[PDB]
């Protein structure tokens, strides 16, 4: 079939690699592996090394903090492709087999496995102004030559391919998500009730999300308005643990309800990036070049995963708010409200191939 190749500026170091993506099963990932070809005449005595690096930028290199860098590594691995590691004999994949068959004798394989609990390749919306190597997590594979591992990385004789690791929707749909609450106040004993639910548990990007809500206004008060929202809780792990929260989409409704009455309705709304350009810090599902990706898909974390190592984690929650009037013998436009949240999942199905920034 087709495979991806790329040769170093020195024209003599080329890498061959089948799939750019590497799907991530809940506890398994496609082993990332390829074959590198070089003109031995050039290689007087140097050794050829290929390295996988999982970097994580969190501050643009132009940042002003003295000394403190902004590029943490999560996992790197090195392999001396040539000399072809006699003691290290690997079970060459059939892909490497066929590649070897095609190219000459001067090609040599390389094969990295991946730690299971690692983040999907995501990048944070770089906003209008800044440029360069964008933020977020990233996976690269370099190939170069040197006699010493710590020696300088002479640019013209090395080549690197970016790589993305992604996940697809769990084939078995989960339990239908929902929640409910009640609120009472110093006025009387009649806590109004509020239940909310979702059509299903997993949604594909653009699948219209439908909230179903019911409310029983027992108390002698009036709900002024309703505000439904879909928010992107994006946890960032570092030396510290911080969490951001960006409202990805929303809607509101002036469906007032009288005291002691009741009401119910289904609303709907769709998360989508189009109208969410300007919001910096938003998380995107990773890019190779500046290809406009889609709203970063929720990380289907394995239950009880050791999220401490996980650089970035993403999750999407819908949230319903009922704002009411506290007026009366003591009250005005200023008043309190109720809110309830339902987490869910937003991912892709399991297709047979991905688009390399086309159309």
């Amino acid at each position, epitope marked *: 079939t*087709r495979v991806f190749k790329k040769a170093s500026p020195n024209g003599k170091l080329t890498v061959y690699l089948g799939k750019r993506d590497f799907v991530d099963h809940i506890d398994l990932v496609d082993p990332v592996d390829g074959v590198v070809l070089v003109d031995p005449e050039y290689l007087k005595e140097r050794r050829v090394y290929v390295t996988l690096t999982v970097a994580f930028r969190y501050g643009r290199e132009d940042l002003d903090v003295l000394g403190l860098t902004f590029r943490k590594d999560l996992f790197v691995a090195n392999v001396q492709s040539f000399p072809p590691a006699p003691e290290d004999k690997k079970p060459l994949t059939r892909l490497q087999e066929r590649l070897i068959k095609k190219l000459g004798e001067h090609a040599y394989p390389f094969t990295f496995e991946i730690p299971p609990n690692l983040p999907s390749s995501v990048t944070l919306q770089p906003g209008p102004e800044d440029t360069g190597k964008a933020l977020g997590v990233d996976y690269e594979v370099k190939a170069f030559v040197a006699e010493n591992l710590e020696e300088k990385i002479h640019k013209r004789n090395s080549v690197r391919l970016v790589i993305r690791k992604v996940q697809y929707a769990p084939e078995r749909p989960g339990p239908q998500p929902t929640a409910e609450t009640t609120r009472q106040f110093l006025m009387s004993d009649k806590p109004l009730h509020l239940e909310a639910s979702l059509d299903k548990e997993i949604y594909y*990007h653009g699948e219209p999300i439908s909230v179903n809500v019911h409310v029983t206004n027992n108390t002698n008060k009036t709900v002024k308005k309703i505000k439904i929202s879909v928010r992107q809780y994006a946890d960032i792990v570092l030396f510290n643990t911080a969490q951001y929260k960006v409202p990805v989409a929303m809607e509101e409704a002036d469906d007032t309800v009288a005291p002691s009455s009741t009401f119910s309705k289904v609303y709907t709304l769709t998360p989508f*990036l189009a109208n969410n350009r300007e919001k910096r810090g938003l998380a995107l599902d990773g890019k190779l070049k500046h290809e406009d990706t889609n709203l970063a898909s929720s990380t289907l974390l394995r239950e009880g995963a050791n999220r401490e190592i996980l650089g970035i984690i993403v999750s999407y929650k819908v949230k319903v708010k009922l704002v009411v009037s506290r007026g009366g013998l003591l009250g005005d436009l200023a008043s309190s409200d109720v809110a309830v949240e339902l987490p869910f999942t937003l991912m*892709h199905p399991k297709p047979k191939e991905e688009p390399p920034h*086309r*159309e």
Partner: antibody
Amino acid sequence: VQLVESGGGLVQPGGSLRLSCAASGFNVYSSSIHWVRQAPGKGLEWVASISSYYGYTYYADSVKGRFTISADTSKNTAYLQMNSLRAEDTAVYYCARSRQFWYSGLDYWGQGTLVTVSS
Amino acid sequence: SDIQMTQSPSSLSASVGDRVTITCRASQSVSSAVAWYQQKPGKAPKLLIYSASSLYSGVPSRFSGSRSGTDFTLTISSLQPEDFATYYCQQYKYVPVTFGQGTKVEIK
């Protein structure tokens, strides 16, 4: 699964017409739209494209700016006010959906509509 | 640029039960980003194969095709009467998405 299309007919040069088509069972935010020309007895000619989930549109270099495509999410419909007819536009026009994620070809086609420029 | 396509041949007469090939070359390298569609007279066309290899779900596997450099090509394994129609190739790697001159299947 179906996809209706209408809003076409006979128009005068330079004129305008908002040919539209609706997607029964397609959240527009997951299925880009395109329109494509067929000159009667000639090869198909892509015309325009809209991708709601990015707001991007792309028009035919032949008539870049001459027409204007758009969409209506509230009804899951797509609009195209063809304007300023350059006479190379008299043809049949189809509107079709991709998968706005992971383009895999024009998997579904409305019945199109014949739109010709004349006097 | 505006990549051009060349559907060769431009017409074809053939017989029932025959296995037939039709090609089209691209003015550049579009890297298998091509789809083959069918269209009968009057009716609206339908996709047949996307990515130049994968047959669409809902087609008989007698259709096939492959890519060699800038030249892709499809084949039918046996021309049924339902298969006598016009066939288009169309790349998509480079906006805008041009088709080819196409190809029309005639009776022997």
